[PDB]
Amino acid sequence: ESEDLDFQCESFKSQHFRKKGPISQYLILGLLPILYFGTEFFYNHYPDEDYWRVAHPPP
Amino acid sequence: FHHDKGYKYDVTTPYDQRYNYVADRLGHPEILGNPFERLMRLEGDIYHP
Amino acid sequence: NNLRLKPWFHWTDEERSHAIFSAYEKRILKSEDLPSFLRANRINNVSTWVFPLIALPLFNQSIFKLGFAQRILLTRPAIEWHCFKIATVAASWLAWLNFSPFYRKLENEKEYLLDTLESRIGINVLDLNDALPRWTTSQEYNRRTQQLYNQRNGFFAGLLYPQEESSRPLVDIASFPKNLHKEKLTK
Amino acid sequence: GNLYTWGQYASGTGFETASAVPRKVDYFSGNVSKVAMGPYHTAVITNDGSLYTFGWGQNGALGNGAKEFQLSPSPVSFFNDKKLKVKDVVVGESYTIAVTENGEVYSWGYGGEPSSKINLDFFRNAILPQRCGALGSGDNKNRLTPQQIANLKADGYKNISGGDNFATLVNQSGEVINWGTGLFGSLGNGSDYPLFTPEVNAYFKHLKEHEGLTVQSIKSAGHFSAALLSNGKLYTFGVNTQGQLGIRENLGHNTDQNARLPTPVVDRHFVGQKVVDFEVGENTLVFLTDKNEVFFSGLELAYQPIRWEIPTDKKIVKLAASKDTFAAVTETGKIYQFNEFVGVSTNEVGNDYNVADSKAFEGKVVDLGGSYGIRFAIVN
Amino acid sequence: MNYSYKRYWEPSTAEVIGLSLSVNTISAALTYPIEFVKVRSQIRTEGVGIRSKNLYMGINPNKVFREIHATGNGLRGFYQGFESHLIGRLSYLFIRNLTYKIIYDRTKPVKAHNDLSHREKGVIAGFAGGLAAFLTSPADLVNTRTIAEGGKPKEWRWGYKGLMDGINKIAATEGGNAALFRGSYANVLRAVILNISLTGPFDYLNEKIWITFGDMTWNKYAALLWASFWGSVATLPFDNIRTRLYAQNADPTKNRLTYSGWADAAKKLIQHEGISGFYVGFYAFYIRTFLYAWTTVFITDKITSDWKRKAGLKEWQI
Amino acid sequence: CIYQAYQNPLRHINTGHNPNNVYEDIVMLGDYPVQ
Amino acid sequence: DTYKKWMYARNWDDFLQRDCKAITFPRAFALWIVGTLGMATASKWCRQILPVGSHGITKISQTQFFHQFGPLGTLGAVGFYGLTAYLYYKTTIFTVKKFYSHCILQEREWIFEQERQNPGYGEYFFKDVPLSAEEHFNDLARGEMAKKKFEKPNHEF
Amino acid sequence: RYSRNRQTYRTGAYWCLYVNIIAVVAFYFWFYKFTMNFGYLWWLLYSLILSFFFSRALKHRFYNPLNVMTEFKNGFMWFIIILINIFKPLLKLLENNYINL
Amino acid sequence: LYLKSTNYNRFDYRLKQTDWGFYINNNSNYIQNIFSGLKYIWRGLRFWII
Amino acid sequence: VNNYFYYLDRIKKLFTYLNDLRKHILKKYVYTINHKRIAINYL
Numbered sequence A: 001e002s003e004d005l006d007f008q009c010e011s012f013k014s015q016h017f018r019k020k021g022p023i024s025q026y027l028i029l030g031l032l033p034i035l036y037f038g039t040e041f042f043y044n045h046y047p048d049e050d051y052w053r054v055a056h057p058p059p
Numbered sequence B: 001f002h003h004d005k006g007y008k009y010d011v012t013t014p015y016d017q018r019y020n021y022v023a024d025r026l027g028h029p030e031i032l033g034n035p036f037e038r039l040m041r042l043e044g045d046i047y048h049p
Numbered sequence C: 001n002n003l004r005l006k007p008w009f010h011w012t013d014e015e016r017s018h019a020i021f022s023a024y025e026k027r028i029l030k031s032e033d034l035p036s037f038l039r040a041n042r043i044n045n046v047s048t049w050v051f052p053l054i055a056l057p058l059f060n061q062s063i064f065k066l067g068f069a070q071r072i073l074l075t076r077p078a079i080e081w082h083c084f085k086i087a088t089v090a091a092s093w094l095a096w097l098n099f100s101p102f103y104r105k106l107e108n109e110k111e112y113l114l115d116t117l118e119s120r121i122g123i124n125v126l127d128l129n130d131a132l133p134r135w136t137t138s139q140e141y142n143r144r145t146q147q148l149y150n151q152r153n154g155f156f157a158g159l160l161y162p163q164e165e166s167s168r169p170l171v172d173i174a175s176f177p178k179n180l181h182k183e184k185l186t187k
Numbered sequence D: 001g002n003l004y005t006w007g008q009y010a011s012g013t014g015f016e017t018a019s020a021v022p023r024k025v026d027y028f029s030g031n032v033s034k035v036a037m038g039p040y041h042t043a044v045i046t047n048d049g050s051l052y053t054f055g056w057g058q059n060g061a062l063g064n065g066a067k068e069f070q071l072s073p074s075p076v077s078f079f080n081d082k083k084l085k086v087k088d089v090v091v092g093e094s095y096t097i098a099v100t101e102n103g104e105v106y107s108w109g110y111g112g113e114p115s116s117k118i119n120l121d122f123f124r125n126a127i128l129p130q131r132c133g134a135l136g137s138g139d140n141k142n143r144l145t146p147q148q149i150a151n152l153k154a155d156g157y158k159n160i161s162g163g164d165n166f167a168t169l170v171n172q173s174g175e176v177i178n179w180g181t182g183l184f185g186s187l188g189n190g191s192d193y194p195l196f197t198p199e200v201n202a203y204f205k206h207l208k209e210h211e212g213l214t215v216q217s218i219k220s221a222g223h224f225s226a227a228l229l230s231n232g233k234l235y236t237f238g239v240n241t242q243g244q245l246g247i248r249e250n251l252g253h254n255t256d257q258n259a260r261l262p263t264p265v266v267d268r269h270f271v272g273q274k275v276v277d278f279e280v281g282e283n284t285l286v287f288l289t290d291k292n293e294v295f296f297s298g299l300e301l302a303y304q305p306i307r308w309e310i311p312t313d314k315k316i317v318k319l320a321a322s323k324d325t326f327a328a329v330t331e332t333g334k335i336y337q338f339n340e341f342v343g344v345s346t347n348e349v350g351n352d353y354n355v356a357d358s359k360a361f362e363g364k365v366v367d368l369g370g371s372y373g374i375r376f377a378i379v380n
Numbered sequence E: 001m002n003y004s005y006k007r008y009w010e011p012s013t014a015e016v017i018g019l020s021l022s023v024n025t026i027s028a029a030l031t032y033p034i035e036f037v038k039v040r041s042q043i044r045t046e047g048v049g050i051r052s053k054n055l056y057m058g059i060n061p062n063k064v065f066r067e068i069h070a071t072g073n074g075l076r077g078f079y080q081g082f083e084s085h086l087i088g089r090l091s092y093l094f095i096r097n098l099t100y101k102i103i104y105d106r107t108k109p110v111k112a113h114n115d116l117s118h119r120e121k122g123v124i125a126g127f128a129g130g131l132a133a134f135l136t137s138p139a140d141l142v143n144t145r146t147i148a149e150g151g152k153p154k155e156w157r158w159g160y161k162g163l164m165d166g167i168n169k170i171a172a173t174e175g176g177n178a179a180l181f182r183g184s185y186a187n188v189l190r191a192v193i194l195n196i197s198l199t200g201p202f203d204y205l206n207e208k209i210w211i212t213f214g215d216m217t218w219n220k221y222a223a224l225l226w227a228s229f230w231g232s233v234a235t236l237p238f239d240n241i242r243t244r245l246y247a248q249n250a251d252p253t254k255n256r257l258t259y260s261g262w263a264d265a266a267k268k269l270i271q272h273e274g275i276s277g278f279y280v281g282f283y284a285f286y287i288r289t290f291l292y293a294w295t296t297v298f299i300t301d302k303i304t305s306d307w308k309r310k311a312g313l314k315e316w317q318i
Numbered sequence F: 001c002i003y004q005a006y007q008n009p010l011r012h013i014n015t016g017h018n019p020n021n022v023y024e025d026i027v028m029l030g031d032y033p034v035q
Numbered sequence G: 001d002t003y004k005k006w007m008y009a010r011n012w013d014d015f016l017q018r019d020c021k022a023i024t025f026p027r028a029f030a031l032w033i034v035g036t037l038g039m040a041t042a043s044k045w046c047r048q049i050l051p052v053g054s055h056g057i058t059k060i061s062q063t064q065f066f067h068q069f070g071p072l073g074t075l076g077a078v079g080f081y082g083l084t085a086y087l088y089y090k091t092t093i094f095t096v097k098k099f100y101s102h103c104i105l106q107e108r109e110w111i112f113e114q115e116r117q118n119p120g121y122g123e124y125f126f127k128d129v130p131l132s133a134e135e136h137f138n139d140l141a142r143g144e145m146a147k148k149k150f151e152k153p154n155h156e157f
Numbered sequence H: 001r002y003s004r005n006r007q008t009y010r011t012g013a014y015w016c017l018y019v020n021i022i023a024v025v026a027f028y029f030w031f032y033k034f035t036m037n038f039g040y041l042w043w044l045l046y047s048l049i050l051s052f053f054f055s056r057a058l059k060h061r062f063y064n065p066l067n068v069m070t071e072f073k074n075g076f077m078w079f080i081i082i083l084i085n086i087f088k089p090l091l092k093l094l095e096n097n098y099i100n101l
Numbered sequence I: 001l002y003l004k005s006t007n008y009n010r011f012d013y014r015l016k017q018t019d020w021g022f023y024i025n026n027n028s029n030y031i032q033n034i035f036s037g038l039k040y041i042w043r044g045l046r047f048w049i050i
Numbered sequence J: 001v002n003n004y005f006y007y008l009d010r011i012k013k014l015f016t017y018l019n020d021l022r023k024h025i026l027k028k029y030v031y032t033i034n035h036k037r038i039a040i041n042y043l
Ligand SMILES: CCCCCCCCCCCCCCCCCC(=O)OC[C@H](COP(=O)([O-])OCC(O)COP(=O)([O-])OC[C@@H](COC(=O)CCCCCCCCCCCCCCCCC)OC(=O)CCCCCCCCCCCCCCCCC)OC(=O)CCCCCCCCCCCCCCCCC
Pocket: B039, B040, B041, F014, F016, F029, G020, G031, G032, G034, G035, G036, G037, G038, G039, G041, G042, G045, G046, G049, G069, G072, G073, G074, G075, G076, G077, G078, G079, G080, G083, G084, G087, G088, G091, H049, H052, H053, H055, H056, H057, I038, I041, I045
């Protein structure tokens, strides 16, 4: 910054090529629907606490 | 030379060989800044090294 | 009973001093309750701005002649010796300010005045507290109380300063009209 | 000549009260030959080879078998009793080393022994290397009385100098023998481990073998050292607290914290010149180059050697460096000083120097020295 | 949650000692080949580290198992040093359980529905585990040396034929009883970390699952899986350093690396392997932890519930 | 720039546009170029 | 309100306890670490802007800051350092008090502990615990805790 | 035919973050009368507080405890020097008063 | 106050360590232009006070 | 060179790598105006 000119190099090797990387991030992505639904319903306890619990009649 | 952006005809003119300022004799203290704007840590385009 | 929380169990020193000052100003506390507390207050002031003086030669005879102090004096520049002496005196001064017998006496006198207030107006002693200015101190409120005592219990009372005896009209506050309405604005 | 001492404090000054103005040590009747001042104690060798140590005798220094202050000058009973004349002396933070005329080397002082049995040596030794001193004993044990360094002969040696916790001997053949604490490249040998016993420096041996550069001299102060080699170059190594090393190419880069190996100073400001001599003080390095030019680094002002602008009309004879001060003595005895080195200055001032008043000393200032807060002048 | 505890039946010292010894003998006998594979995986990557990339990072437990089986000793070759492992584990458990029981009985709350917070029980368990691991370090050392040899050159092997034989050889050759306690501080650190990394995570997820899904039956096993994962994450670096210190030969020549202590071992692990070099054999360590914990919890719960039902406790108190 | 000096402080008014531990301003807090 | 206060923090102890919510000891120590970093940075800034005792300088006059701005700049730097040191001392006292209370005396922020014990939707209403719920607090305790009476003040003013 | 265009918009990214904060916070406060309890996740609040002092202390390597101790000592000595040099003119004025008398 | 005071300041040595040809080192006494920073501070805040 | 802080050098490289990666991520995905990265963030 402040000492590199804002210009474009003549060579094509200055192109920003995309290369792949790690895969654990995509492990997180693959379970995204499971994690999102679990977060909402269980973590936020929606609609209420007793809905997802195993059903018991009152004494 | 800059092997990724530059050419072999990249020779910096040394500060000795650059043309001296002769247009006027009065000084131009803008290039120093001010004690006020140095104290205030203000960055100006006219005193940027 | 030492298990009952007094209404001012959370108040700071500034809040306690302001409560006492407001009680005296509002003629809840008479000038007959102040002379002890005020006296303690003055002693506390003398206990604050004299201690470093009292602590300056004493250390020169007790602490600054010790082995560690002499080592600092002999093997370090004079500015570091001054720094050591000033730091020691300032630490002693801070410890004195936090734990001073005269400060404890002043706090006890303020507690006695607050107990008298609670005996007089009951739980309404909490009505003497407000949102104090940030930089006004307990000493400043004590000085204001002392100034009010000097004004009332001295000359010019009734000439330049209001007297200590109230002359408020005798009315029935249950029926007498009030300035503020409960919910709306009135004219 | 008569001794003159001054400084910020009164530990190693030979007196009991400090004085900025020079004060004449006259316990010696003009027989002072050499003086070595550490941070807190001083050792003086007279004409007859007698050794007098004074100052703070912590960790068994001063060669008196105690750990108390001895502000007044006092002879060392180990050498005076046997009439063993001492040739040279090196004084460091809490140690003393004496080179006698027969070549034997003695040491006494702090050696790295832990102060108390209750200490955090577990975590520290898990983190930092084991503590050591400038003794050649081979163990971290304090020497309250002078004791010979086994298997070390200093006869015909070019130089001997030591820092706060390390020592170095440069022989006539250019061989460098180091011992003490080598942490952060103080010894310049490329290792941070302590050297309890003296060992030959491998880096300078490699330089003399391959590059063919012979070590002219080595001078140390604090945890910093500078070496002058066969070519007119200075190689600094140690802890760069305040820019003493003079190895910073770019003023704005704070990456020069320490140099494990001897790195050459930045030759930018004296291209084509060869260093004639140099002097090392606790936070400063002042060297004179053959164009009669004085360059300095340190004091948190110059992180690379920049020229001192004292007049070059008169040849510079002596150089001296000390904590936040330094000075240069010319042929005529005129003493230029950066900051108050002598303590008295005349009205003659210049862009970066004052002139020390000649009235402070009674005679001609033959020698100047002192690198940690207390300074001395040997005056004839 | 401080009223939520259920301690209406407290087992006696004899009961806890006998049950712990028997159940943990079974558990250790079941997972000893997994421990063997983990130790071998840690041994084979001392100066190397993890050199694969992406999903291949680490050492495959099945590959090590196949190599050890192809050695030619069969499954009995995975139980070499099991005498040392079992004796050390049983002694460690005896000392730890005795000290924990004593300090707990001196400190446990009066009410049967109250109990020490996980920090207090963690302090007690850490002290007990540190003491027991310090005392059983010779047995752990002999076991680790027995396992490690085989993945080492012939001249680097110790050749131990038992626990007493190994102890005699260590004392006689290396010299003194201080030789038996090589790397004992590593074992102490490992036991301190292991004794505090399982109770915390287990109760956390168990209670959270109960809050979410009510009183189902899978709650404790999901919480056990989670606790095993976090205990393996916390304990594995210390186990790795303990393995490195235990397997180091007395002769500095016969070592890929020489360690002068726990800190030195950690430094030389970070230098050559990096941070990820700590977690080698993580799958094996986690699987062994989960299997051992599941076996112990299952059998102990069955036995203690049977004991409680014979003590007259109601169903909600069991 | 942590432990590595990429930027050139000789060509910047204020070094500290990025979190770093290896840069120092040439014109420091108390420095004022004057005529 | 008469706008005599804006932050409504009586002192720095109140600020740290309530505004920053350093109710526990780890929070107090984290705030102390932040304050230590800030104090070190402020000291370094003051020593850089007024370099007395750094390069052999011994007098305030022999600094470029004094040449440019004079005694007003020195007063400003002294005030800045004094305020920073005052706030750091207050933070240190707060942290030491919290360490003595929570770690030595084993005191806690008990409402915070109650919130820690129940994670919002737990089922911990038990008959054995009188304080578990409002239904399980026995009526005898309610009667007994309210037996005494307040004193009637004497309106002697 | 268009001049070179800068390839980053940092002020734009932060202006949009502020727009999101304004929308959510203002709408919750106006309609739900809700204000987020920043003390619930106190360590995010600490990260906000820490960030104001982290970088400047990082520049001087104050993450090292030794540097902090050295800086404390040097700063206190600097403060003492300034105060002493302030109060010595009182002694100078006293001597001037003696000579004036 | 500046009887025996040298011309150079810290910034002068810092400048001598840089390749900034546009700035030079002061060679005369600063008594003539002393306390000019206050003048520049006034000029900076001149239109902002009211 | 028998430096005593080789592990420390590795940790220093890790810290430098983390700061460089932070700057890279911010400049490439958050502060960018490239339409492809913005579209992928949208997705
Ligand atoms: C009638 C007289 C008229 C005037 C006469 C002439 C006067 C001349 C002298 C003036 C004062 C000289 C002394 C200045 C000291 C500082 C020197 C300096 O350059 O510092 C570096 C600093 C920036 O350095 P940098 O390396 O470039 O950093 C860039 C960013 O700032 C980096 O930002 P960041 O976000 O990374 O870092 C955040 C934070 C980081 O902060 C730190 O690292 C340390 C800061 C203190 C922290 C304390 C923490 C305590 C512990 C807390 C723990 C608990 C947790 C807390 C949680 C909550 C946290 C928020 O940094 C700051 O806060 C920097 C700004 C500090 C400004 C200070 C302004 C006041 C100074 C004077 C006070 C006077 C008091 C009364 C005096 C009289 C008494 C009788 O410089 C400035 O900020 C320049 C502006 C301020 C300097 C003075 C300007 C005066 C202008 C003329 C005034 C005329 C009259 C008033 C009208 C003004 C209208 C505009």
